[PDB]
Structures are given as structure tokens and as C-alpha cells.
């Protein structure tokens, strides 16, 4: 019904696997591979989420990588 | 454009599994099981698609069940 759960799973994977002082380019690269590392049921939903939110994801992730807060701030959560 | 391919895959499943004059109750039942029959990568996206579009899907599938046209008319495609 919404992108809230997939957003939190994806930002979780990034937070665990990226360092905090990653460049925008490094965040971009990771974001466009990260969906593949979520459980398979999430793949195409995650690809869609990333396509729709990619600009705002890049801009927030440089500052903060907390899954709950990032997803809240960008408007993916609640829903 | 986001839901276009999942819509066609799901309505594809319904087309294959429902007769032309299925009741709204029978279409609802199929629609709410259909996502589980699509390939694993499409599952969570299909659920979100069904949740978002379920009223209009019921509305149209009584009339027409062609995947491409149904998905176009409801606005999932292109």
C-alpha cells in the first residue's frame, strides 16, 4: 500500500554497508545496487521506490542514514 | 509508469484464471490471491499495486480483462 517498509529496509542496508562520510557519488552507486540485497519479494517495489525518490535520497543520505528518520523526512513513512 | 509492468502481469494472471462473466466477489477473491502467483521479485510491488488500485480494478475487470487495455484505462500504463 506504500513505500514505508521498503524504504526502511533499503536505508537499513545502506547504513550497515556504507560509511558515514561517503560522497554523493558513492551513495548513488550503492543506492542503485542496494535493492538487489533486500529479500527478493522486495526487488521490483524497491526499484520503483528508488526511481521515484532517488534525488531526495541522495540529498538526505549525505547528512543522516537512520532508516526511520530518513524515510519519515522524505515522506515515504508512514504509509 | 511505475506500476505498468506489474499491472499487466497481474491482469494477465486474472485473464488466465477467470471466466468473462465472473462475479465482482469472484474477481475480488482472485485479485487478492493473484500477487502470490507472480514471480517472487514482483510480489511486494504487486501487493502495493492491488492496494492502491483495487476499487477501479474491480470496476473495469467486469467489463474487460485484456491486460494491456485494462492497465492503460486505469492509468497504470504507460
Curated annotation (Swiss-Prot), chain A:
Glycans are attached at residue 21. Residues 2-79 form the Saposin B-type domain. It comes from the Eukaryota. Changing residue 7 to Y: In PARK24; associated with disease susceptibility; affects the intracellular trafficking, resulting in endoplasmic reticulum retention; affects the intracellular trafficking, resulting in endoplasmic reticulum retention; cells carrying this variant show accumulation of autophagic vacuoles, impaired autophagic flux and alpha-synuclein/SNCA aggregation. Changing residue 48 to P: In PARK24; associated with disease susceptibility; affects the intracellular trafficking, resulting in endoplasmic reticulum retention; cells carrying this variant show accumulation of autophagic vacuoles, impaired autophagic flux and alpha-synuclein/SNCA aggregation. Disulfide bonds join 4-77, 7-71, 35-46. This is Saposin-D. It comes from Homo sapiens.
